[PDB]
Amino acid sequence: MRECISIHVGQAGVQIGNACWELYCLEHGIQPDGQMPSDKTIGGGDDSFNTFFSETGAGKHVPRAVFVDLEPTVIDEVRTGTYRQLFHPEQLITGKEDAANNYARGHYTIGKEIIDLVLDRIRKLADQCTGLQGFLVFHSFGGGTGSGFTSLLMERLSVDYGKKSKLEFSIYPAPQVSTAVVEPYNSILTTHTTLEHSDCAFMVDNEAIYDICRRNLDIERPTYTNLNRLISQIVSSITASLRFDGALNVDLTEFQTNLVPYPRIHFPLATYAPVISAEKAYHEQLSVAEITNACFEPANQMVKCDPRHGKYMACCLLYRGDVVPKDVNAAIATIKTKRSIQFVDWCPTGFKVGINYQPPTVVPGGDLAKVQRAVCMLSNTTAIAEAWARLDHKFDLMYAKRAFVHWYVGEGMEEGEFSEAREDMAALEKDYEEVGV
Amino acid sequence: MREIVHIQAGQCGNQIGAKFWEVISDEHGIDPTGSYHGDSDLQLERINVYYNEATGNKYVPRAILVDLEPGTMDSVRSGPFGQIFRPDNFVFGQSGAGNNWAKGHYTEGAELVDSVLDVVRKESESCDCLQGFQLTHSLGGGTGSGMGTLLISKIREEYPDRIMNTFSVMPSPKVSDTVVEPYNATLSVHQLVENTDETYCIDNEALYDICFRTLKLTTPTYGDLNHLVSATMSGVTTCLRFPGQLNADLRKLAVNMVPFPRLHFFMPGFAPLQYRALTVPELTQQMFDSKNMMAACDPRHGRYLTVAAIFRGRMSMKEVDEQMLNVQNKNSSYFVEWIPNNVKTAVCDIPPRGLKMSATFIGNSTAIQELFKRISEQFTAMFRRKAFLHWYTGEGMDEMEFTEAESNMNDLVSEYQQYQD
Amino acid sequence: MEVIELNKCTSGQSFEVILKPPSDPSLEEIQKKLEAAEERRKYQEAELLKHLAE
Amino acid sequence: MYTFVVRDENSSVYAEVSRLLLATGQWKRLRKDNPRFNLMLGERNRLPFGRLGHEPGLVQLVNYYRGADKLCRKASLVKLIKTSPELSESCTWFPESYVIYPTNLTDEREVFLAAYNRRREGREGNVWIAKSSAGAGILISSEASELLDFIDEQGQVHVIQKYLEKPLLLEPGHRKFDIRSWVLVDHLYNIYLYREGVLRTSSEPYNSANFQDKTCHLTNHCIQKEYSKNYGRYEEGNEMFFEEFNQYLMDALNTTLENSILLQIKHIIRSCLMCIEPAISTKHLHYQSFQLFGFDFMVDEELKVWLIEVNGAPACAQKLYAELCQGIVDVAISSVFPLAPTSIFIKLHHHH
Ligand SMILES: Nc1nc2c(ncn2[C@@H]2O[C@H](COP(=O)(O)OP(=O)(O)OP(=O)(O)O)[C@@H](O)[C@H]2O)c(=O)[nH]1
Ligand SMILES: Nc1ncnc2c1ncn2[C@@H]1O[C@H](COP(=O)(O)OP(=O)(O)CP(=O)(O)O)[C@@H](O)[C@H]1O
Ligand SMILES: Nc1nc2c(ncn2[C@@H]2O[C@H](COP(=O)(O)OP(=O)(O)O)[C@@H](O)[C@H]2O)c(=O)[nH]1
Ligand SMILES: [Ca+2]
Ligand SMILES: [Ca+2]
Ligand SMILES: [Ca+2]
Ligand SMILES: [Mg+2]
Ligand SMILES: [Mg+2]
Ligand SMILES: [Mg+2]
């Protein structure tokens, strides 16, 4: 057994992290007080769920998680929320004033003064691990902390844990739920400095989660709670292999091995189905073929883009619930004969399939309906480069006039870092084009 | 605990500041004696942003009243909520400033500024994490204009990394006290260009026209004008006084509204301006209409760099997004296309007293150059004949300082013009 | 259409279907970056204070 | 008040559509870089499809189907027809074609020579034509040596397809021709065939014993108006419209245009567009597409119709710009953005 440490940075990372550990507890039968009756080994054990939960002498199961935010109002929710008893104070770290949506302020000004503190609290968790795998880092692109402090944390983690894997869950900026105009700047600045430090990153576009919540859940104006409960379902589907007995994606190294043949192209597209409203009178339960087919519908992707006009480098199918391999292969056969699935010639045209028999858990009183089977597809498509192009274009529009740049230069960042970051994205876009076109 | 320290200087600054604390004190459930008597936890959630908490559960505004003559501040102390202010936070002289920028900035004001900074320092030393400062003042007089901008200068020296924000009342010949107002305003504007992060330009001409034409007030008084400023000051600060993530503090607001450091002068607007229900479409149409603007500049004469809108009350947040997206998509020729998504909307549930719902508008428009042009022309009409300069040279000033303020404001105009094309 | 590496346990199983065969900065350098930016901030504030002193 | 942007200043078709849109008083034109648009009249090359459909509260529509180049490229069309089961290699309405890369660069050289050697041995007519998309650059020859050497002197991909040695020749004149059909596909993927086509005729008598003079073999409107000496003799601008052509087919061949030709054309249009529908459909996409296609057909002396190529940005006959452009506004633009008959199109129903 090897442990995973989850790091939550900024408001997005903290509130998403709050929703994940809520779901993790429901899945593993852990109560808000940390007690796990089903756990017959009191105060220890090297079970699969122990990769995410430590244990005390009193039987408390404590998340292997750190929460970091430069302002205290969001982490204060955790300290007085339902799961306040899960974490001890050392795990929750807050400053007094935030990065003000300014990458330079989170990375340089405030990051320099709090980086050593965060690394110290992470070292404490690491010392409780007999074989640490690596880190899962949740954060947004647009926030000054999510962007600026994360990139600094990723740089130091590569120094302090050279042989450890690092995976990201990143929130891509969407104007429908964003009030910061400079988020394209922060997104590109943090991708540039985190690229060589992240082994695999799962981007979630808020625009996609927003529309899924309006379309499938009939929420006219989704909130962060609605968005985060849906995101934690996808996150749960992705991390289930590390927390339950299995043979696929059993450690963090396997995510790169299976999804990322080229290091810089490490942004798999996530697609999830089914998302059914809980207020529905009663939904006809979808089959393996239908939920699998839904994995190739743009409306269910975590990033709106057209995989029909890209090329696949890898494809994983993560099923949860009543699913047997026979029905999976049948559905895949039918989808090849109908869908436009073009793989790169230097990669086999295949699918790695993982099945966990425990159906998805839904938060009681939540928005999602209990379904008998679900699937999350992780596919490395060149089509996700559309999200880079969209973001890079917005960057170019503002930077051509040096709009807002003085805020970053005022925090000590040099203007050259803007163009250095943009040129690195231009090279990233060219890599996708060389592989897919 | 992100505290803001409030300063009000001069006659105009203290009369508008008084009304401001009267309005938001009501919205937060604070009575004239500082005792809380509201009924919603949303009122106290961010109460510490503008109020200190004294013994006995008393809420005392974090406000500093400054003047070079006692008259106006005596009225405030005798006004409705006069008793709510800290007695030690009244700092005033006896000489007055005679509507003379030089007297407030170099002579009379210099004698008094150190005692004001001592009270500023006392309020900051008791702040858990000070956001910054907001100053209410006029630009056409002597104390608020001359001493106010001296205060900003000395506050920026001692707190260089805090946000400096002002509500600045611009003079107009239609609502004028003395002919030297263009001189005092042109000298102040240069100070503001350098030492403030955000300045809400409140034009007394716009306030007058709104009272005469829209509100149908035959003979508007200074009191009538200040009612519009109160409502506006309460609208623009709602994001700071209640929960939210959209421009929730002064620095985040500045980051979203100011793409270039010197172009930080905002046109504010309010809607509505009597028992009939006001729909979201009506709130939106009016809020973007020039007649509802407080700067007396036609937005259709320039382009919006950034826009921040705040909707207050129980309404359809979906219907708000639809109407906001309808004004942008129906007039995108007035929004610079090189700042994507430069229109941000915030919603607050607590409406203002006596209104089911309202909307407040904050625009960083290049049309604001029309305001600086009016001042510049009035300035030059007198300065070319050196008229009324003796009031200033008698206080140690030289003509060169006027020539430089003039050039500085004409540069500011030219800077707005280039981003408008 | 081939299935390989079928692994079954009590809580699930995994396999692989093949449809067709194919055809850093050191700790020292990070401190320099952080201190270089802090120095540029100090220089900018000194110029501001020098401007205010004039 | 709907908003649109123009990104192809060279399109005569959408220049007229843009003019009509403004006349309605309900459409407003924005700068070509303004992202807040309902409708994009996009550029031909490298249209940024990835930036469409990400504007909150804007239903966005573009006049090109992403991926339709698979049909409108010479080499792509041949590849699509040979590899798509819906069309099969034995497709009977497309001339035998092969994709031939120049030797200075899969490639179907040896496959072409095999079929060529078979014709030469069996006394059959063995005349082929070589062309490419990088042309105004065409060569017609009966010797395989000349066809292949002509492509090597070039540097772009080419296609060698059988030359219809038995074309249908109009009389009087003994002259070749081709049929242009305009087809509009809307956002719901309805296939609308414009009721009005044009025959681009050659004003020179067809000569089978001399492929060196390419004026009587190539019916392009530019070639006939530049290298032909009988331009505009039989019909104005070497353009015969369906009414005249139909009347001719009745007097001469005792048949109608619908029976002998139009049925096959409609069948071909359906087959091609239904084939790529799964790949280019915008049904479940965050933006919508429509596109106007120019199908070019050949008719042989047996009244069998052959598909020559598909044009993704076609021009229109001068006399038919008004009717067709208005039709694009009715079914393609106003169907998504309604304004505050007897259709001019022929709906080719199909299964989605
Ligand atoms: N899905 C989701 N997105 C969020 C959430 N909170 C914030 N965001 C997005 O994150 C971006 C803003 O960044 P934040 O994470 O709030 O900022 P931060 O990391 O706290 O950094 P600061 O600038 O110091 O506040 C916007 O695009 C928001 O839409 C959340 O809870 N869920
Ligand atoms: N296999 C074939 N048999 C007989 N004629 C042919 C032929 N292929 C092409 N042609 C002749 O070539 C002319 C058009 O060639 P083609 O369409 O391939 O080039 P092009 O695309 O530049 C013209 P357009 O796009 O306007 O139709 C037609 O008029 C037709 O008569
Ligand atoms: N809106 C408003 N403007 C005022 C008020 N009092 C004065 N002014 C304006 O402010 C300028 C005079 O400045 P004033 O505040 O009286 O001088 P000071 O006391 O030296 O700062 C003139 O332009 C007046 O029109 C007021 O109560 N409300
Ligand atoms: Ca145990
Ligand atoms: Ca590493
Ligand atoms: Ca004195
Ligand atoms: Mg934050
Ligand atoms: Mg006065
Ligand atoms: Mg062509």
Side-chain angles (χ1 to χ4, degrees), chain A, chain B residues 1-245 248-421, chain C, chain D:
Chain A
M1 179 277 302
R2 306 186 68 198
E3 298 87 343
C4 293
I5 296 179
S6 294
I7 306 174
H8 311 278
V9 186
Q11 174 179 129
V14 172
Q15 290 184 166
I16 292 178
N18 221 17
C20 294
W21 291 98
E22 185 196 23
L23 183 51
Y24 292 163
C25 289
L26 299 173
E27 292 185 352
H28 295 292
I30 297 177
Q31 306 174 2
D33 60 332
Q35 297 294 329
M36 184 181 181
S38 59
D39 184 10
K40 302 309 174 187
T41 50
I42 300 297
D46 52 6
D47 301 323
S48 291
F49 66 90
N50 286 127
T51 64
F52 279 60
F53 294 92
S54 63
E55 302 181 27
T56 68
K60 174 182 293 185
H61 299 63
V62 184
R64 307 187 190 268
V66 189
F67 295 74
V68 192
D69 199 3
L70 305 187
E71 148 244 23
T73 55
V74 177
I75 288 186
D76 281 338
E77 304 287 12
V78 182
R79 296 190 180 105
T80 61
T82 294
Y83 291 91
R84 56 188 179 271
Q85 291 189 101
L86 285 190
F87 326 86
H88 43 259
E90 294 81 13
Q91 303 172 263
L92 308 179
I93 309 177
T94 61
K96 296 225 171 175
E97 60 180 350
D98 63 30
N101 290 328
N102 187 337
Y103 170 98
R105 188 170 175 88
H107 185 104
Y108 298 95
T109 308
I110 305 182
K112 176 185 182 296
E113 302 297 321
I114 197 181
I115 181 59
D116 292 332
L117 169 55
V118 175
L119 288 179
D120 182 81
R121 304 292 175 83
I122 291 172
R123 178 65 64 187
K124 284 180 182 174
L125 294 182
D127 299 344
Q128 286 186 140
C129 305
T130 60
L132 181 63
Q133 306 188 31
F135 304 87
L136 307 181
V137 185
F138 301 78
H139 68 104
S140 68
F141 276 172
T145 302
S147 74
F149 181 72
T150 300
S151 71
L152 175 60
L153 184 65
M154 296 287 273
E155 288 182 310
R156 291 289 295 267
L157 292 180
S158 301
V159 175
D160 290 12
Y161 309 88
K163 303 300 182 62
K164 276 63 170 55
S165 294
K166 294 192 289 294
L167 278 57
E168 295 186 72
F169 295 87
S170 307
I171 302 303
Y172 180 101
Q176 263 169 319
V177 293
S178 163
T179 57
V181 181
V182 295
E183 290 190 49
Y185 284 177
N186 300 332
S187 300
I188 283 172
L189 294 173
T190 198
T191 300
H192 168 56
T193 57
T194 305
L195 206 54
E196 276 300 67
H197 298 279
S198 183
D199 301 301
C200 186
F202 300 103
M203 284 196 307
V204 181
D205 187 336
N206 268 351
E207 173 185 88
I209 302 299
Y210 194 80
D211 280 313
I212 296 175
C213 287
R214 296 200 296 178
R215 194 190 321 107
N216 304 29
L217 303 180
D218 288 335
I219 317 296
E220 301 201 60
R221 214 307 179 178
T223 65
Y224 281 140
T225 302
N226 299 132
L227 300 188
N228 290 344
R229 286 198 175 116
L230 176 52
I231 290 173
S232 61
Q233 289 292 335
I234 286 69
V235 172
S236 172
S237 299
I238 298 171
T239 68
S241 54
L242 308 165
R243 299 177 286 112
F244 295 97
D245 194 5
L248 173 68
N249 299 338
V250 65
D251 64 69
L252 298 178
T253 289
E254 203 159 344
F255 286 89
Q256 166 270 325
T257 293
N258 291 329
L259 298 169
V260 185
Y262 270 65
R264 285 171 58 82
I265 317 297
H266 61 245
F267 299 88
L269 174 70
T271 314
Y272 189 83
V275 181
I276 308 302
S277 175
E279 303 290 331
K280 248 180 174 293
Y282 232 72
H283 198 78
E284 343 76 49
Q285 284 305 265
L286 297 185
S287 69
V288 174
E290 299 173 338
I291 71 174
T292 301
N293 183 28
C295 288
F296 299 88
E297 286 293 341
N300 309 310
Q301 298 164 356
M302 295 307 107
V303 187
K304 285 182 175 181
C305 60
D306 197 342
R308 296 175 301 180
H309 298 104
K311 280 197 175 191
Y312 290 86
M313 290 159 278
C315 195
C316 267
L317 290 172
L318 305 180
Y319 295 89
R320 298 179 76 166
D322 185 53
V323 185
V324 295
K326 174 177 58 179
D327 295 324
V328 175
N329 296 321
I332 291 176
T334 299
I335 289 184
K336 271 300 298 180
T337 62
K338 286 182 168 59
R339 298 285 188 172
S340 302
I341 305 169
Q342 272 298 321
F343 272 74
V344 293
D345 303 324
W346 46 277
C347 294
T349 300
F351 303 86
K352 284 189 177 61
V353 177
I355 295 178
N356 194 289
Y357 296 148
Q358 186 173 289
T361 301
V362 292
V363 184
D367 305 296
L368 295 180
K370 179 69 175 185
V371 306
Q372 274 302 2
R373 61 192 56 89
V375 56
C376 176
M377 186 172 74
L378 307 178
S379 66
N380 199 330
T381 334
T382 65
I384 208 173
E386 303 175 25
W388 295 130
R390 302 159 49 209
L391 202 59
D392 287 334
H393 181 61
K394 287 181 178 183
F395 183 108
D396 293 339
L397 284 173
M398 286 188 295
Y399 192 69
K401 316 282 184 293
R402 298 301 185 264
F404 304 97
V405 167
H406 67 281
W407 287 109
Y408 297 73
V409 179
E411 296 293 354
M413 200 177 86
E414 299 185 290
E415 203 180 52
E417 179 163 353
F418 265 97
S419 55
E420 192 191 87
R422 181 58 177 93
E423 300 178 11
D424 191 13
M425 297 299 310
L428 185 61
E429 284 196 71
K430 177 172 177 176
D431 293 330
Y432 278 102
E433 192 173 16
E434 294 182 9
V435 180
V437 191
Chain B
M1 319 177 189
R2 45 190 57 168
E3 298 83 15
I4 290 169
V5 172
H6 169 93
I7 303 173
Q8 50 191 59
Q11 178 171 29
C12 183
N14 273 283
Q15 288 179 153
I16 287 181
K19 299 299 300 186
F20 166 76
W21 285 105
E22 178 178 10
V23 173
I24 66 165
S25 287
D26 173 79
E27 297 183 12
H28 289 282
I30 307 295
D31 69 358
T33 56
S35 292
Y36 172 80
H37 286 289
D39 63 332
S40 174
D41 296 333
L42 298 71
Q43 293 174 313
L44 303 181
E45 190 94 24
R46 313 244 284 193
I47 195 74
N48 57 22
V49 170
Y50 281 95
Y51 293 87
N52 280 312
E53 217 171 329
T55 308
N57 198 23
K58 287 290 185 178
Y59 293 95
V60 188
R62 194 175 300 99
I64 307 174
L65 301 72
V66 187
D67 208 349
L68 284 167
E69 66 191 7
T72 305
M73 286 172 49
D74 283 0
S75 290
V76 169
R77 188 182 303 105
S78 304
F81 286 69
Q83 311 294 330
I84 195 187
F85 302 104
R86 202 181 194 276
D88 293 326
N89 286 27
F90 290 78
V91 184
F92 57 93
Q94 302 288 318
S95 64
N99 291 287
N100 189 317
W101 193 90
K103 288 192 169 185
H105 203 86
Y106 293 121
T107 56
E108 311 295 340
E111 188 171 356
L112 184 76
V113 71
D114 276 3
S115 53
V116 173
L117 296 182
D118 290 350
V119 176
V120 170
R121 188 175 309 102
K122 182 280 171 188
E123 286 293 356
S124 297
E125 296 176 356
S126 64
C127 285
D128 182 33
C129 190
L130 169 74
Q131 288 195 63
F133 311 86
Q134 72 176 35
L135 171 85
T136 66
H137 68 152
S138 74
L139 305 190
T143 303
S145 182
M147 190 185 186
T149 55
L150 179 65
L151 276 174
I152 293 168
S153 197
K154 290 183 179 297
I155 284 181
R156 195 187 180 187
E157 195 177 13
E158 184 166 11
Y159 308 89
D161 67 334
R162 301 295 81 176
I163 294 295
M164 178 70 63
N165 187 2
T166 77
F167 298 86
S168 302
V169 172
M170 315 284 176
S172 164
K174 316 316 179 61
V175 185
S176 169
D177 295 338
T178 68
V179 296
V180 296
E181 289 165 2
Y183 282 162
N184 300 326
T186 295
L187 296 166
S188 288
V189 169
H190 176 52
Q191 302 298 316
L192 296 178
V193 169
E194 281 190 347
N195 301 328
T196 76
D197 299 290
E198 301 164 293
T199 288
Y200 299 86
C201 299
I202 300 166
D203 187 328
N204 258 3
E205 184 167 12
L207 301 179
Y208 188 93
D209 294 331
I210 291 174
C211 288
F212 189 104
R213 313 188 196 185
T214 302
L215 293 180
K216 299 306 178 190
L217 301 173
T218 304
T219 313
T221 69
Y222 275 133
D224 294 322
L225 281 51
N226 297 340
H227 175 82
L228 298 181
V229 184
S230 296
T232 301
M233 296 189 58
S234 167
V236 309
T237 69
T238 285
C239 287
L240 310 173
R241 304 185 285 109
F242 299 94
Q245 308 83 329
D249 58 274
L250 292 178
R251 178 169 284 104
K252 260 179 178 180
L253 167 66
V255 167
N256 288 332
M257 293 290 292
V258 188
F260 310 103
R262 291 185 294 287
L263 315 193
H264 57 262
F265 299 92
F266 303 151
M267 305 194 322
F270 186 86
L273 291 171
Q274 47 177 150
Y275 315 103
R276 173 189 170 188
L278 208 57
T279 78
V280 174
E282 292 176 333
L283 268 185
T284 309
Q285 302 184 242
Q286 300 186 208
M287 178 182 45
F288 281 96
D289 192 329
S290 58
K291 306 201 303 292
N292 291 67
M293 305 267 172
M294 311 278 161
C297 300
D298 194 351
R300 309 180 79 99
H301 294 178
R303 313 188 80 200
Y304 288 115
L305 297 172
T306 57
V307 175
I310 301 81
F311 291 80
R312 308 185 58 177
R314 309 177 69 245
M315 65 190 70
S316 175
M317 188 170 301
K318 158 188 172 64
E319 194 178 14
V320 174
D321 298 324
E322 295 186 0
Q323 290 301 333
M324 286 305 299
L325 297 175
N326 178 273
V327 167
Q328 310 176 46
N329 301 329
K330 291 186 69 67
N331 309 282
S332 60
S333 50
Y334 301 101
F335 298 84
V336 304
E337 69 287 353
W338 39 272
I339 299 184
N341 312 113
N342 57 342
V343 182
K344 301 301 180 182
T345 310
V347 180
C348 178
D349 300 325
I350 300 176
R353 180 61 84 109
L355 287 183
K356 286 287 187 64
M357 54 188 50
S358 64
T360 299
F361 171 92
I362 309 166
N364 190 342
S365 168
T366 67
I368 197 72
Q369 73 170 296
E370 292 186 329
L371 180 155
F372 299 115
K373 277 183 180 174
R374 290 197 297 270
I375 304 298
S376 183
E377 290 177 338
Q378 299 163 9
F379 175 99
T380 296
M382 293 181 298
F383 186 62
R384 67 186 173 184
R385 301 293 283 269
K386 297 182 176 178
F388 307 98
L389 280 185
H390 73 98
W391 299 123
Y392 298 85
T393 61
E395 302 298 320
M397 288 187 70
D398 187 78
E399 297 181 354
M400 184 69 66
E401 180 158 356
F402 286 71
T403 295
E404 300 177 4
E406 177 185 49
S407 303
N408 294 330
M409 193 154 65
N410 287 338
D411 287 329
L412 185 63
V413 166
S414 296
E415 189 168 355
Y416 279 114
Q417 180 54 30
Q418 62 176 102
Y419 295 116
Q420 180 172 316
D421 311 325
Chain C
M1 192 67 177
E2 183 186 23
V3 170
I4 68 182
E5 293 183 357
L6 176 62
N7 288 119
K8 296 168 65 184
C9 67
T10 278
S11 63
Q13 64 185 297
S14 68
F15 58 93
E16 188 182 11
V17 61
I18 304 181
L19 313 178
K20 182 203 301 182
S23 304
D24 285 335
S26 63
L27 185 71
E28 162 201 27
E29 302 174 331
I30 292 174
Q31 276 298 297
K32 292 171 185 173
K33 293 182 182 176
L34 296 175
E35 290 173 347
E38 178 183 26
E39 212 57 13
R40 286 187 291 273
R41 268 197 319 276
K42 292 177 179 171
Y43 179 92
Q44 301 164 19
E45 179 174 305
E47 297 307 325
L48 170 55
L49 293 187
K50 182 204 312 294
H51 177 84
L52 289 174
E54 296 171 351
Chain D
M1 184 72 62
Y2 305 101
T3 63
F4 73 97
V5 301
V6 173
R7 295 170 71 87
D8 185 359
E9 307 284 329
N10 303 328
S11 170
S12 49
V13 167
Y14 292 93
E16 171 68 342
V17 172
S18 176
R19 194 275 302 187
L20 290 179
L21 292 176
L22 295 168
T24 68
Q26 311 176 30
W27 281 84
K28 182 182 183 300
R29 175 175 177 176
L30 314 167
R31 305 192 204 91
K32 57 204 313 169
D33 300 308
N34 193 326
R36 291 197 179 284
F37 56 82
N38 294 118
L39 172 63
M40 162 177 293
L41 310 183
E43 57 270 73
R44 302 183 192 90
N45 305 118
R46 304 203 60 83
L47 197 168
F49 294 99
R51 309 212 305 260
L52 293 170
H54 304 278
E55 279 299 341
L58 284 183
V59 185
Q60 292 187 317
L61 179 70
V62 62
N63 66 327
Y64 280 100
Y65 265 97
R66 194 189 182 182
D69 52 316
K70 260 64 181 174
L71 206 59
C72 308
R73 244 69 179 182
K74 303 286 206 306
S76 298
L77 179 57
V78 172
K79 175 178 178 178
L80 180 70
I81 291 184
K82 287 185 174 181
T83 60
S84 297
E86 302 79 19
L87 317 186
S88 72
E89 189 187 45
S90 63
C91 167
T92 64
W93 40 260
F94 187 72
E96 188 179 6
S97 306
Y98 302 95
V99 180
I100 296 293
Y101 290 82
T103 59
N104 51 277
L105 279 56
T106 54
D107 186 71
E108 292 178 322
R109 271 178 178 267
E110 292 182 345
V111 181
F112 155 81
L113 304 180
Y116 178 91
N117 290 324
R118 175 175 292 178
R119 287 184 166 273
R120 158 173 294 190
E121 181 185 13
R123 302 294 91 103
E124 291 185 334
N126 213 17
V127 178
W128 300 75
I129 178 176
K131 47 188 176 179
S132 63
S133 298
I138 284 71
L139 176 60
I140 314 170
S141 182
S142 62
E143 303 297 322
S145 58
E146 299 181 356
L147 294 176
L148 296 179
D149 293 336
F150 171 82
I151 299 180
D152 302 337
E153 301 156 346
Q154 300 295 353
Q156 62 284 356
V157 185
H158 276 63
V159 295
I160 298 180
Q161 72 169 189
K162 187 66 188 63
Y163 186 85
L164 306 178
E165 308 179 28
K166 302 178 176 181
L168 182 60
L169 302 181
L170 304 169
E171 302 295 357
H174 200 68
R175 51 207 181 98
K176 195 176 183 178
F177 72 92
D178 80 326
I179 299 180
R180 158 63 62 84
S181 295
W182 294 277
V183 170
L184 177 67
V185 181
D186 66 3
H187 59 293
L188 302 176
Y189 217 90
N190 295 323
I191 302 173
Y192 293 105
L193 170 62
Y194 185 23
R195 77 160 91 101
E196 298 286 346
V198 305
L199 285 66
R200 292 173 289 179
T201 67
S202 173
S203 51
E204 301 296 340
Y206 179 80
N207 190 90
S208 56
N210 180 20
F211 308 98
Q212 180 181 2
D213 187 351
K214 303 177 298 179
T215 299
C216 81
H217 296 273
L218 289 61
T219 61
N220 296 314
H221 190 283
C222 66
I223 302 179
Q224 297 294 321
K225 195 173 184 181
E226 272 288 359
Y227 303 102
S228 180
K229 304 184 179 183
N230 282 324
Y231 180 85
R233 179 187 184 184
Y234 307 91
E235 44 276 341
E236 193 171 0
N238 291 10
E239 293 181 346
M240 176 183 303
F241 294 94
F242 276 9
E243 180 176 348
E244 176 178 2
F245 183 50
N246 178 74
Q247 184 64 226
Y248 170 86
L249 293 176
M250 294 183 297
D251 301 336
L253 286 298
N254 186 34
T255 190
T256 67
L257 172 58
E258 164 71 28
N259 285 6
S260 73
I261 295 173
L262 216 53
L263 280 182
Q264 298 169 79
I265 281 187
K266 285 181 292 188
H267 168 71
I268 299 176
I269 297 171
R270 285 184 52 191
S271 298
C272 296
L273 287 169
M274 283 183 60
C275 177
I276 66 181
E277 177 174 8
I280 71 174
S281 173
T282 64
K283 183 180 180 182
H284 298 293
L285 211 55
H286 39 284
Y287 70 89
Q288 296 299 312
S289 296
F290 69 95
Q291 187 170 355
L292 179 67
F293 296 96
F295 282 77
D296 295 329
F297 300 96
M298 279 283 301
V299 190
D300 66 15
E301 60 183 25
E302 299 291 287
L303 295 180
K304 178 185 173 176
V305 171
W306 301 85
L307 174 67
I308 298 312
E309 73 156 11
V310 187
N311 295 269
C316 192
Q318 163 62 353
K319 186 194 68 178
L320 304 178
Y321 269 105
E323 196 174 28
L324 175 55
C325 288
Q326 176 60 43
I328 296 180
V329 183
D330 291 359
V331 308
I333 299 183
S334 296
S335 58
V336 191
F337 310 104
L339 301 170
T342 301
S343 178
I344 79 170
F345 298 96
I346 305 167
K347 184 180 178 181
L348 309 180
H349 294 85
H350 67 274
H351 298 179
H352 311 279

